Design a protein around this ligand. Structure first.
Ligand code: ZN
Ligand code: ZN
Ligand code: ZN
Ligand code: ZN
Length: 296
């Protein structure tokens, strides 16, 4: 009952992929700084807005990886931030939206990257890691196993990608050294080789070339099941209308999407983008999802 066209149902595209395929092998669309969609102040937007729509919109369009940046509060909760700015979005808000999506579409999995974005507030009873584990992670929705996580074990659950230190509970992908503004390679869950392109503050041409170089590598290493490729197409703000995350995404998203469309590869990696929407064609997240055709 599995056909390649089933990859076209953006809310259930992982359904046709076999249970035994490692998530690392699947080409998955993701959203950079996922919770910035509520920013209204034009000054806050030009500097930190990276998405126009909420979490469910993102998921219904195919996004399965979410970049969550939070801050520990005096209430022993974690809220979403962009630097010192509160995004009016909370961690529980994201998880609840993910729970709803997973309930409605049990064939899917949601990968949640969690990073400490700003200094803990005074008054918290514990640490960022201990508070997350005690008040959020205990929830059954979170996958508690590790290794080269397979889709079958992830269906209906949230798979954690730690970007914070001090973890004391098993589950998801372990935290690893993440050099600043670079393309680097390292290892994670004992047997998973990881390559990340996260040059968030390089010049535009350098960014475009870096995305392409890393994707070219991914396309020619399609059978490497234990290799994880994370490719951020997002680029940090210059503080003006002509160099905001939106202006950059308007050209980068269609450019990279065309690369995939023209090459028609069997793997392109975990592509984390800014502004998932239907304004620019070809649509990046759709071409990324379509690159899983050979897995069916
Ligand atoms: Zn309080
Ligand atoms: Zn909401
Ligand atoms: Zn490898
Ligand atoms: Zn739409």
């Amino acid at each position: 009952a599995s056909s390649v066209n089933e990859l076209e149902n953006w809310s259930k595209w992982m359904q046709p992929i076999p249970d035994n395929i490692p998530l690392a092998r699947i080409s998955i669309p993701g959203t950079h700084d996922s919770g910035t969609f509520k920013l209204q102040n034009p000054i806050k937007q030009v500097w930190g807005m990276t998405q126009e729509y909420d979490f469910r919109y993102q998921m219904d369009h195919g996004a399965r990886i979410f970049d969550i940046r939070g801050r520990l509060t005096d209430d022993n909760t974690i809220v979403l931030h962009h630097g010192p700015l509160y995004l009016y979005v909370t961690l529980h808000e994201f998880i609840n939206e993910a729970k709803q999506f997973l309930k409605d579409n049990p064939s899917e999995t949601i990968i949640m990257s969690l990073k400490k974005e700003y200094e803990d507030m005074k008054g918290a009873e514990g640490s960022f890691s201990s508070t997350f584990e005690k008040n959020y992670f205990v929830d059954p929705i979170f996958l508690k196993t590790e290794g080269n996580i397979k889709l079958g074990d992830a269906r209906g659950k949230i798979v954690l990608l730690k970007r914070y230190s001090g973890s004391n509970e098993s589950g998801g992908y372990n935290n690893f050294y993440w050099p600043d503004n670079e393309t680097f390679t390292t290892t994670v869950n004992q047997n998973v080789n990881v390559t990340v392109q996260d040059k968030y503050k390089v010049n535009y041409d350098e960014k475009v070339k870096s995305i392409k170089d890393t994707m070219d590598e991914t396309m020619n290493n399609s059978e490497d099941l234990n290799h994880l490729y994370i490719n951020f197409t997002s680029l940090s703000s210059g503080g003006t209308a002509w160099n905001s995350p939106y202006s950059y995404a308007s050209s980068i998203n269609p450019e990279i999407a065309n690369d995939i469309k023209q090459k028609n590869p069997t793997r392109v990696g975990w592509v984390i983008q800014d502004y998932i929407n239907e304004k620019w064609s070809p649509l990046l997240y759709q071409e990324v999802i379509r690159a899983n055709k050979s897995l069916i």
